[PDB]
Amino acid sequence: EKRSKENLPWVEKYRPETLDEVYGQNEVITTVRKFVDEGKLPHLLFYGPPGTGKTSTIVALAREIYGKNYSNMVLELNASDDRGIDVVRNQIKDFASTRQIFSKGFKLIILDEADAMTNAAQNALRRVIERYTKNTRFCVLANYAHKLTPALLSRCTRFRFQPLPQEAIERRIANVLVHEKLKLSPNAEKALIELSNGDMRRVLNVLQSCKATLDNPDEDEISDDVIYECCGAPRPSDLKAVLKSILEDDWGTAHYTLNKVRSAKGLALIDLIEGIVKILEDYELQNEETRVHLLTKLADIEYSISKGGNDQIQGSAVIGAIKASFENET
Amino acid sequence: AQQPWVEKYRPKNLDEVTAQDHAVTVLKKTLKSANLPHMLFYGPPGTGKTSTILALTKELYGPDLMKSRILELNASDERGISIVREKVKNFARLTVSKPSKHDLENYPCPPYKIIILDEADSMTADAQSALRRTMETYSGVTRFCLICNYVTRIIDPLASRCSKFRFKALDASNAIDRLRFISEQENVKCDDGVLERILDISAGDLRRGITLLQSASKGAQYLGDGKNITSTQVEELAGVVPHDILIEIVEKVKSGDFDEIKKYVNTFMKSGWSAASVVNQLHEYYITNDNFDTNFKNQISWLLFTTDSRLNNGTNEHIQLLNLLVKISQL
Amino acid sequence: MSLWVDKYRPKSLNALSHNEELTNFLKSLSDQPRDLPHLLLYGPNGTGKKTRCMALLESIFGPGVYRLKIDVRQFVTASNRKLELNVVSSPYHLEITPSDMGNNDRIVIQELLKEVAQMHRYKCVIINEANSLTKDAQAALRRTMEKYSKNIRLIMVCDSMSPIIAPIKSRCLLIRCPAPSDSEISTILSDVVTNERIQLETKDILKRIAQASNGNLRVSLLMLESMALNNELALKSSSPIIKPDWIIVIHKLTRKIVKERSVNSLIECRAVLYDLLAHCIPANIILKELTFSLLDVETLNTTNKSSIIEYSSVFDERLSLGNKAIFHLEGFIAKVMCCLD
Amino acid sequence: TLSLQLPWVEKYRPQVLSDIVGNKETIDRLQQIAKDGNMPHMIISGMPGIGKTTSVHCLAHELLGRSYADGVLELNASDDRGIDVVRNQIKHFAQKKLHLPPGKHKIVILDEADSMTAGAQQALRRTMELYSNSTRFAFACNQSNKIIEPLQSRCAILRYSKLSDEDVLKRLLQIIKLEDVKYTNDGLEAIIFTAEGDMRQAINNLQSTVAGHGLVNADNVFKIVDSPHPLIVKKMLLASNLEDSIQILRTDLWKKGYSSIDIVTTSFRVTKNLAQVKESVRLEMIKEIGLTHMRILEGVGTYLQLASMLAKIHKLNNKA
Amino acid sequence: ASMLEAKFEEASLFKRIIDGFKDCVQLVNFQCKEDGIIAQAVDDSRVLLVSLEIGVEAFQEYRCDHPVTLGMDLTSLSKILRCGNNTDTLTLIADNTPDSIILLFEDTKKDRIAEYSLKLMDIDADFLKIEELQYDSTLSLPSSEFSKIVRDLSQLSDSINIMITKETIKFVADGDIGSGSVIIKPFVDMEHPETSIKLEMDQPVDLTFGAKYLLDIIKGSSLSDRVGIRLSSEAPALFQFDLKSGFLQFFLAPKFN
Amino acid sequence: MLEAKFEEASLFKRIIDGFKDCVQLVNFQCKEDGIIAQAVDDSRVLLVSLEIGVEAFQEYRCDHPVTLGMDLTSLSKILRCGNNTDTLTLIADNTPDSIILLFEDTKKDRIAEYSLKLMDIDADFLKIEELQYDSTLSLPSSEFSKIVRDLSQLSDSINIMITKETIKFVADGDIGSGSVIIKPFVDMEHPETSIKLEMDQPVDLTFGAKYLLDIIKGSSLSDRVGIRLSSEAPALFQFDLKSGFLQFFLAPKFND
DNA sequence: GCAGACACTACGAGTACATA
DNA sequence: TTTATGTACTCGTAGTGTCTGC
Ligand SMILES: Nc1ncnc2c1ncn2[C@@H]1O[C@H](COP(=O)(O)OP(=O)(O)OP(O)(O)=S)[C@@H](O)[C@H]1O
Ligand SMILES: Nc1ncnc2c1ncn2[C@@H]1O[C@H](COP(=O)(O)OP(=O)(O)OP(O)(O)=S)[C@@H](O)[C@H]1O
Ligand SMILES: Nc1ncnc2c1ncn2[C@@H]1O[C@H](COP(=O)(O)OP(=O)(O)OP(O)(O)=S)[C@@H](O)[C@H]1O
Ligand SMILES: Nc1ncnc2c1ncn2[C@@H]1O[C@H](COP(=O)(O)OP(=O)(O)O)[C@@H](O)[C@H]1O
Ligand SMILES: [Mg+2]
Ligand SMILES: [Mg+2]
Ligand SMILES: [Mg+2]
């Protein structure tokens, strides 16, 4: 790096350095702290969605076990480096077989993003794990468990990282605002919670971009308007207005309202579709067929949007799908 | 000059990037600071992602350090997991180039370099998985700017690491100032609604509007009469179907008679029109009318959506157009 | 040359009597050749797009565009799967085709264009069959033409530009080439028959030739030459209009489908389709001609025709999304037979 | 840095053939081979965690404890196995002259042999054919279909089945008395249910419960480890109302941090292994689930795709 | 003018230094200060740690007014060091906050000049101050004898065990084709002070090392005629090749029991 | 009709060591005045020529011109039996189906007779146009081979630029850059290592590394190698010999 | 000291597999 | 057999170094 901190993104500037700074996964942190305090650390497997604090947790755990110089005491392998079966046969075998060069403790092997590892490498890793388990522990971080062999899943204790709740995001946001002397309105906080979707990294990126959005970073408070303008997300009022126009008015009014809402602030159609879907899941639909029609048609529309095409045709298709599905109600 | 108006009028600064204000102000404020994050530029084609990143690089470093502190990769060179591993890691794990006294005195050179990965949607997911921890580890010395137009082709972890900046489609209200400025600079005489019609024809694409303006200007000079360009000329250049032919399409469809529709579609397709424009014009005719009830529009919106999604995947325009017109005819 | 279709091909913009507005547009583009952007000519097949491209090159560069030769360039893909491709080069321009392997058309677009982009001041590259690219050569070509533009320019010739991706259509000036009417085809054929020596009684046979070609200069010219050769250079009023052997086989297949709708009929159709695909005939054109031959049968009502065109669209999508061409054609024929019976 | 205690998986690994539980007939056959000593070439197969390699090691130890170091060659996937590094080493070991008791032979244990190269197996064929008088082979693989036909011809096939709840329960109680830890019957049945026949998984979960809470009860067990997602997916696919399946999906998979691709693959596996419903219904469900799988793989991984897949499942189930 | 100017009497010395440990490790930081050029590098398997040190005496003329870290690839440095002769001289030139260093080659002839620049690289490895605690067995033997013993015993097994008991050095390698044992007594030669085996006895040891790491260590045995091996039951082994002004220390981690 | 006898066996093998990788096989054209053999590589980039005079032969007889299309691997396999005292002898007849190689030794009565079949090429595209070169420099063969292989260890291309009294070789790869400068100098003590450069116009040319390796593989032919350069023109790599010279025709890499 | 004579590592070409 | 990347394996060859010998 260069120029120390303050030149880093807030994703990397606020990486936890202690296991007490990892919010959300209270059960996982307490269990691993009990594991390291009692002197029994099994072969861990951290599973969960991105941004939930897996590599941060394992880095803080290794730092707690060893100290500041954990980087030289731990063999960390990731999909960035080559991880063929030659690597498993030489580097992992030598690191597991040999004694510690800097201390008198056990060896820790961190297989970061190990879901991108070949089948034969995992097959060798099974025997490597079983053979040298007396003085070497393996930690496997993965986002998808279907890419791991069943025997590797059997050999490793599974810890699931649940998406970050309300309290954890609020606490981290409060810490960041305290550090940066930044202000933020509570409704903006709820908007950021909604935009998080269990991802702390999205929260940090949006906070950085919104601090850059304000004309003066001091003595101006972040509002929900700033969050929605910087992120480009549709406001709940806009989604409610679009849905009301579609569900209550004729085609001309609905089309005009959707076009006006999209062109007022440059709203994306996929964001509107996601918001409309989230609103419609709370509806008390009378028929079992309205849900089927809505879900299938909107999935087809969002797939076509992902493949790209004409936005006007897709918007009219959204309006028509919603109206036709709700025509089955009565 | 010696270059097309698209390349001639590329935004040299960040002040010249119109429409998109949120991302431009974020980058402008980050210019003074050094908190540039890993960015993910996305949006429709022609919205100005490459121009924005080029300008941001231009006044981050200057004309001198730009070559040394930038690695730009495209689909023009192979980007398998081997190259995306070794070349990207080798560039990132280097130290940043040393600026001169002149560069420090004039430009605010940051202590990091930028690895611009344009057209990142075409990369293999294995290459992106390799890119993940390289992006995370060397953040203090290098920055990554993924430029794509299809977000779903980028895996979830990279979307998590990379700050996302959506580029708005350039509507006729956002991009009217840029085309007005270009017309004033190039001495293009046009009517009141000609620029608005040009922006309406394009679907959030200022580049296509600039090309249409260039073609209209070229025709105007070739005629040599010095007359103002009308909307009909830029409509003929854009390839949109005239309204009388669309009226004939509607009249043929309304009366049924499969054979008549088939023959007229054969003639219309040998006329050489692009089926996507025909479907768009049929949509904007049928949906915006007041002579059709709610059920007809509900069905025709899905019919046009299916036809457009089919036309996007190659296919034969004749068969798709005939099927769409026949399905509309039986509504 | 020996064939009349290549004997009277125009060599200049002023030598074209095919589309007045299109020729005026090309003259406007050639009036200021320095700022000429990347073009993309699209339209129905056989109308004279490449004739327009060569005439525009002659108007921009000069005579010598048609003094062109062929050189072979060696390209190596992954492993040692050696591929031989020959470029039809010339002074003042280059010509390339996706005629290489469809999954290996990216390497030519990468290496050849990076080589010719090394250094009036630019060279023009013509890409025929541009609709046959496989979404990766186009992806490379996006930045290949956006970055290198002051020294290389593109004239991208294609028909039915839907497979062309959105960014390529964004950075290409689209030019539309319509097919002529019956009068223009008849005029060109009359010019041919008066430049050569053909005995003709009533020009209605030329009108019939224009009708048969369906707005196709190449097909009409070859049909005229073939009918003159068969009639010993003396065209008759009731001269039988020729059809390609493929068209006759497709019509026989359509008659078989209409007449008998059993499963032995299906295996006979499979054999016919296997022969047709084995004899260098594209699958999408096969499906289009089969569809429009089925819709020309008068014994079907409107419901069968609508179902036929719907299944034709669905299996055209499938053909565009698949590689085993016989599978989708067999499925389409089975579905049509199930619908009709 | 503090040292770590031995895990319960390896601390309580059986050392004799009587401590291993499960397939009583196979273990009795192994003990009779133990008594006789004329051990034939054997292939041991089954799903992971049911006592495959520990039985081989116990058999070798009891057969020749004094010469385990000398006349046992334990090659495996961690070791480099190829054509030459296998043929040379195994030929040298098989031709090696070592003096055993009259009923004993050298044992070449090819643990994890399903990943071996075919040419290596071809050389192994003649190795076993020539040197069967001195050395004997003992394969152990998860999937026995990878081993070529002639090797399975020149071997004694020993198939291992997943343990019933009774055997895993017996081993769990034995280890509990050995470790002297408090427990509740509900927690033990929860551990057995979570293990699904895998003894190693049961031991790992029991040790995690003991070291994280201290009391093996249902609440602690379900706190540390969740119910398996195949079961929740199976009850999501078999639910009656579409709303029930939608809410099960959302709450128990989406809010639990389960990837959409994992949910789709699990649904495919369950529908393939599902049994109560008719075959054609399963085929239609697999077809539409695979369409959704293609959509997920192309990049469109959202909640809406899973909801649409469930809606299509219900539109198929209610018979239009 | 340039900040760092480290001249070499002969260009062959630094090539020999690099080739001694160019294969075991490929990332290295050269810590240039007034005292000398020192470098610590850790193997990719985190088994073999190399602690290079070149004093100010080994340089013809040396000046480093400010400390600077030099992140280098040993593969690239080795392949760029081949561009020289034995008579040629070397001068490591660096500026402040450098992008690269200039491998400026010279000669007796002023016509022969060759300039090479290899870009520096960013390494965040925190640098460990080794205490070098008391070793149970401290022994010195000629490098040729140690290299021969290691090469002969590497063909037998993958692990070489070194037992130092009752003032007797013993190397054993139990393998598949057979087992071998080389026993050398600590004799002293008054005839030659370089072939004498020296051994200091405090406590007996029993340490097993890998064969490939021992081969990598003995590949750097051309730098000194004698290698001083110090062993300990709780510390990594030390293989010090003393240079004219500094030393080349190899720290090897023994296998677990 | 051809009776060629070398003074010593270790001459023609030493010549063809350079020929090994520059071109797979050549079409010999043996005349009474001398022996020549020219061929073109696969990519038509590097061309090589050979010229051996009669003075290098103890007894050279050539009644009629003889065309020999022969490979090099089998020929070198034959020549591997060349003792330090054994003498080469090339024997051919009318319409040679196979060249006759015979060996004679003085200290021993043993005789070695070998024959090699003659292949076909059917491509004798020959043309010589350029004779005048703007720049001309002479370097030792060992020094030139060392410098070019050292630069090839750093980059896949080598840049050779000439200025007044500064023979400069520039190499720039991906790991870094390398600049080498050697100046002309004449010394009486060691004329073999003397370096001279006479120049008319500056020359800037970039060449490929593999072709330079092919050129330098014949480093044992001459103690000093005279490479002369031309601006915006292909350069010639000439190797001296007692009774002739060998030259390498290499085109530039699109100089501009 | 120099030329082989050797065994060694490294590079290149080719084949085969890819869900249980 | 086609299939289009990436991995792993196997083999063969070319350099690359070191040990014997005169
Ligand atoms: N529980 C948490 N408490 C505090 N910060 C968190 C937490 N989880 C994530 N973060 C933040 O998220 C940033 C990046 O997440 P990481 O934990 O480093 O990566 P990850 O969570 O393992 O996601 P993947 O699977 O690697 S893409 C960290 O630098 C933290 O700032
Ligand atoms: N926001 C903008 N302001 C001004 N000109 C713009 C803007 N966006 C696009 N342009 C024009 O569009 C051309 C450059 O387009 P690009 O910046 O390459 O678009 P893009 O983001 O690269 O879209 P792609 O690369 O095809 S996905 C120039 O003619 C610019 O003048
Ligand atoms: N039948 C059994 N009786 C007792 N312990 C068992 C039994 N099966 C498995 N275990 C325990 O499971 C752990 C390891 O079992 P292994 O036999 O090594 O698994 P495995 O049968 O080899 O399956 P794979 O395919 O190798 S992963 C040890 O702690 C054993 O004690
Ligand atoms: N103005 C014209 N006069 C005479 N013939 C023409 C004219 N325009 C086109 N043609 C005919 O068209 C043929 C070429 O068409 P072609 O380039 O194959 O069309 P496409 O490129 O659309 O397939 C030529 O043989 C030529 O005879
Ligand atoms: Mg992580
Ligand atoms: Mg771009
Ligand atoms: Mg096992």
Numbering used by the authors:
A (entry chain C): 6 to 335
B (entry chain D): 23 to 353
C (entry chain E): 1 to 119, 133 to 354
D (entry chain B): 4 to 323
E (entry chain G): -1 to 255
F (entry chain F): 1 to 256
Text of the article:
The eukaryotic clamp loader is Replication Factor C (RFC), composed of Rfc1-5, belonging to a large family of proteins involved in diverse cellular activities, referred to as the AAA+ (ATPases Associated with various cellular Activities) family. RFC uses ATP to assemble PCNA onto primed sites for replicative DNA polymerases δ and ε. The RFC pentamer forms a central chamber that binds 3′ ss/ds DNA junctions to load PCNA onto DNA during replication. We show here five structures that identify a second DNA binding site in RFC that binds a 5′ duplex.
In the RFC−3′-DNA1−5′-DNA2−PCNA structure, 5′-DNA2 binding stabilized the otherwise flexible Rfc1 BRCA1 C-terminal homology (BRCT) domain. 5′-DNA2 is sandwiched between the BRCT domain on the top and the Rfc1 AAA+ module on the bottom. Therefore, 5′-DNA2 is primarily bound by the first clamp loader subunit, Rfc1, in a manner similar to Rad24 DNA binding in Rad24-RFC. Four basic residues on the top of the Rfc1 AAA-ATP interact with the double strand region of 5′-DNA2: Lys-314 and Asn-459 H-bond with the phosphate backbone of the primer and template respectively, and Arg-476 and Arg-477 sandwich the template strand, with Arg-476 inserted in the minor groove. The 5′-recessed end of the 5′-DNA2 is blocked by an α-helix (harboring two aromatic residues Phe-552 and His-556) of the collar domain, Phe-666 is precisely located at the 5′-junction, perhaps functioning as the ‘separation pin’ for 5′-DNA2; and Arg-663 in the minor groove appears to stabilize the 5′-junction. The recessed 5′ end is in a cavity lined by three basic residues, Lys-208 of the BRCT domain and His-556 and His-659 of the Rfc1 collar domain. The cavity is larger than necessary for accommodating the 5′-OH used in this study but fits the 5′-phosphate snuggly with two potential H-bonds. RFC stabilizes 2 unpaired and unwound 2 additional bases in the 3′-DNA1, and Rfc1 stabilized 1 unpaired base in the 5′-DNA2. Furthermore, the 11 Å space between the 5′ end of the 3′-DNA1 template strand and the 3′-end of the 5′-DNA2 template strand can accommodate 2 additional bases. Therefore, DNA1 and DNA2 are held by RFC like a gapped DNA with a gap size of about 7 bases.
